[PDB]
Design an enzyme around this catalytic site. Structure first.
Site, mmCIF file in Angstrom:
data_model
loop_
_atom_site.group_PDB
_atom_site.id
_atom_site.type_symbol
_atom_site.label_atom_id
_atom_site.label_comp_id
_atom_site.label_asym_id
_atom_site.label_seq_id
_atom_site.Cartn_x
_atom_site.Cartn_y
_atom_site.Cartn_z
ATOM 1 N N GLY A 174 0.817 -1.195 0.000
ATOM 2 C CA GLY A 174 0.000 0.000 0.000
ATOM 3 C C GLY A 174 0.854 1.250 0.000
ATOM 4 N N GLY A 228 0.400 -4.501 1.027
ATOM 5 C CA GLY A 228 -0.873 -4.519 0.325
ATOM 6 C C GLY A 228 -0.954 -5.634 -0.698
ATOM 7 N N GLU A 260 6.290 -4.345 7.886
ATOM 8 C CA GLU A 260 5.616 -3.240 8.559
ATOM 9 C C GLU A 260 6.274 -2.855 9.875
ATOM 10 O OE1 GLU A 260 3.514 -6.105 7.720
ATOM 11 O OE2 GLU A 260 3.437 -5.231 5.708
ATOM 12 N N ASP A 304 -1.365 -5.415 8.483
ATOM 13 C CA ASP A 304 -2.675 -4.976 8.036
ATOM 14 C C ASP A 304 -3.199 -5.912 6.944
ATOM 15 O OD1 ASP A 304 -0.549 -3.863 6.378
ATOM 16 O OD2 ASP A 304 -2.130 -2.720 5.374
#
Lengths: 53, 217
Positions: free
Chosen positions: B67, B116, B139, B147
């Site tokens: 992302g 993502g 992350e 996520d």
């Protein structure tokens, strides 16, 4: 004969005004109809496009 | 005028979604996520689409490097918190749509699939890996969390040393990069297909159709 000449003149003038009003309405309706046609719907996402090319 | 960020094309009865941000390694922004989320709802209603194929136009360089969080950081520095919450509502809503999608989705993880990108594949039962696959969840080094529903997927799909989510915690907390065959053996990839065979597979996927009176769902 006086009523005939004055009713005829009124009819002619009233007919020009009615046509002018009717034409303007039709023109406005056409713009609205066209705007609805150009409105993007969700189904349009499934139509393949090559906008850039 | 500019090249669309995500390109949609027809492959017989299969609908191909291609990520088209090569310079950013196919990073996912709000625009990309929103486009894919809306087009997938239409394909779900369609009775002529049997399956969807999520790929990249940059293979084998990358499928999705993650992302677009660098843009979300600038938003935070500018107090544009509404913009940031829009970016995560779109991405997470797309990850939820893919997970619950009733038609088969086939992701070609031909390249870097990090962040993502993992959300685009981890939620599909048909997540194909290649020799060029590089799965990671980096992350912890950026200060964010795992996520895209990776805390619901990894603890349920990993194959080895995952009785109590031990391996899932190892990948999420260490950010280790898994490559190709290893991703398939760990359960990160459902299938292992050579990159050279992806063209042929795509054609076969478009040609197959439900038989008789069976729907694609």
């Amino acid at each position: 004969l006086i009523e005939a000449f004055r009713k005829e003149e009124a009819r002619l003038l009233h007919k020009h005004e009615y046509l002018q009003k009717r034409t303007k309405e039709l023109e406005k309706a056409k713009e609205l109809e066209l705007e609805k046609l150009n409105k993007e719907k969700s189904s349009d996402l499934t139509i393949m496009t090559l906008d850039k090319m | 005028t500019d090249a669309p960020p995500v390109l949609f094309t027809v492959q017989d009865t299969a609908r191909v979604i291609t990520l088209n941000r090569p310079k950013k390694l196919n990073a996912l922004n709000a625009e990309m996520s929103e486009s894919m989320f809306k087009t997938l709802n239409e394909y779900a209603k369609s009775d002529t689409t049997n399956l969807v194929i999520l790929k990249s136009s940059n293979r084998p360089r990358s499928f999705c490097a993650g992302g677009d969080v660098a843009t979300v950081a600038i938003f935070n520095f500018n107090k544009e918190f509404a913009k940031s919450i829009k970016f995560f509502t779109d991405e997470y809503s797309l990850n939820f749509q893919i997970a619950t999608y009733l038609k088969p989705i086939v992701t070609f993880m031909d390249g870097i699939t990090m962040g993502g990108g993992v959300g685009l594949s981890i939620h599909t039962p048909f997540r194909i890996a290649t020799e060029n696959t590089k799965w990671a969840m980096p992350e912890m080094d950026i200060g964010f969390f795992p996520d895209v529903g990776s805390t619901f997927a990894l603890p349920r799909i990993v194959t080895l040393a995952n009785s109590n989510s031990q391996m899932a915690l190892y990948l999420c907390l260490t950010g280790e990069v898994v490559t190709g065959a290893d991703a398939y053996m760990l359960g990160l990839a459902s299938h292992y297909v050579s990159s050279e065979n992806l063209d042929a597979l795509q054609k076969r996927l478009g040609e197959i159709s439900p038989p008789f009176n069976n729907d694609p769902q």
